[PDB]
Amino acid sequence: VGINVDCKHSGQCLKPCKKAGMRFGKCINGKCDCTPK
Numbered sequence: 001v002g003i004n005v006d007c008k009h010s011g012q013c014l015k016p017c018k019k020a021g022m023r024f025g026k027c028i029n030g031k032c033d034c035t036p037k
Contacts, residue, residue, distance in 0.1 A: 001022055001033060001035070001036050002028070002031050002032065002033035002034065003016060003017050003020040003022070003025075003031065003032050003033075003034070004031075005017070005031065005032045006030060007027030007028075007030065007031070007032050008027075009027055010025060010026040010032075012027075012032075013025025013026055013027055013032030013033075013034060016032060017032050017034040020034075022035060022036040022037075023035055023036060023037060
């Protein structure tokens with residue numbers, strides 16, 4: 001998992017990853033890696 005976005009922080013990973021198809025979201029190596037359903 002993990003979407004094609006650019007995080008300044010993990011908090012902004014929620015929305016785009018939720019739209020992507022996952023539940024939450026964390027900032028990693030510039031990516032928003034999340035946990036799905």
